[PDB]
Amino acid sequence: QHVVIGPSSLIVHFNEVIGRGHFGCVYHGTLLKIHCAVKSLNREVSQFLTEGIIMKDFSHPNVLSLLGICLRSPLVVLPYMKHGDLRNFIRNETHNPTVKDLIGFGLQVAKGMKYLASKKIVHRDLAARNCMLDEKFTVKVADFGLARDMYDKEYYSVKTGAKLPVKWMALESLQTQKFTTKSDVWSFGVLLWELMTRGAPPYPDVNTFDITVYLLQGRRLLQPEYCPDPLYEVMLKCWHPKAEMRPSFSELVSRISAIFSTFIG
Ligand SMILES: CN1CCC(COc2cnc(-c3cccc(Cn4nc(-c5cccc(C#N)c5)ccc4=O)c3)nc2)CC1
Ligand SMILES: [Cl-]
């Protein structure tokens, strides 16, 4: 109810398309004198909102928050994230963040997920492409509730129906399609790997279908050259086949902050 912001407050710059999605494109906005991201929803809507309304209660420095929505293809207002998504940023030929900085972003994602895990929310699509950065280089775990979409179709394979992020998905999800907090831990492992390779595509010489047999043979992603061993030991623990022996997010926050603390820059 309070989520519903009035139409005269929100401006939407349709020519400046900042993101692109399946359900709708993400246009630039200016709510009045603050900057915004306005996500459309062109192409179910009744069902999508009731799950989304719970988003407003959530607040945490490393989780994306809801500013509001405007009814009229209803528009979803979201805080403007200056430095874009995290997959685009670490690849960006401009900012050269250190190994420490990359481990810092990963630690920040651990805290966003620790929060959401404490609320019993399963993300289901945790990846560098679905995490944003603000002016202060704070990582915000996004793509959940009303912000939920596909923002880069290449990493989603098309019998089931709904398109799945196979290369980020854990072994039980690939076989069953049942997602959990311990499955989200697998995805986090893959995301950490992205940070240490600076946004390299996981499993470059592998088809979208073939990851289940690949993983079952006893294979994992290799250790990146500048990935410090302890972090590789963490990455491997996240891909433990028993979704039980995998580490909790509170343990991930604890262990990674220890690793982060051992660097200069
Ligand atoms: C060159 N260009 C200059 C402008 C820069 C800043 O532009 C922005 C782009 N997007 C936002 C934004 C903010 C809040 C919420 C969302 C919605 N949302 N989007 C994505 C998303 C956005 C873009 C690319 C990809 C991928 N792959 C994924 C993921 C999760 C999610 O929840 C978007 N803000 C600013 C980017 C670089
Ligand atoms: Cl930090």
Q: Which tokens sit at 174?
A: 């690939």
Of 57, 85, 101, 125, which one is the catalytic site residue? 125
- Resolution (angstroms) equals 2.7
Contact 103, 231 (CB under 8 A): yes
Q: Nearest ligand to the C-alpha of residue 257? A: 2
Q: Is the dihedral of CA 26, 27, 31, 34 positive or negative?
A: positive
CA 40/CA 189 separation, integer angstroms: 31
Residue 109: CB within 6 Å of ligand 1?
A: no
CA 224/CA 232 separation, integer angstroms: 8
* Amino acid, single-letter form, for residue 12: V
What CATH number belongs to 84-262? 1.10.510.10
Residue 26: CB within 6 Å of ligand 1?
A: yes
Output the 3-class SS for 223-234: CCCCCCHHHHHH
Closest ligand 1 atom, residue 152 Cα: 27
CA 230/CA 213 separation, integer angstroms: 27
Nearest CA, atom 28, ligand 1: 151
Nearest Cα neighbor of 99 from 187, 197, 185, 201 is 197
Q: Following DSSP, what letter does each residue of the chain receive, concatenated?
A: -TTB--TTTEEEEEEEEEE--SS--EEEEEE--EEEEEE-----HHHHHHHHGGGGG--BTTB----EEE----EEEEE--TT-BHHHHHH-SS----HHHHHHHHHHHHHHHHHHHHTT---S--SGGGEEE-TT--EEE-S-GGG---S-GGGSB----S-B-GGG--HHHHHT----HHHHHHHHHHHHHHHHTTSPPSSTTS-SSTHHHHHHTT--PPPPTT--HHHHHHHHHHT-SSTTTSPPHHHHHHHHHHHHHT---
Is 21 annotated in a binding site? The answer is: yes
- Distance from Cα 19 to the centre of ligand 1, integer Å: 5
Q: Nearest ligand to the C-alpha of residue 65? A: 1
The method of structure determination was X-ray
Closest ligand 1 atom, residue 19 Cα: 23
Contact 231, 193 (CB under 8 A): no
Residue 39: CB within 6 Å of ligand 1?
A: yes
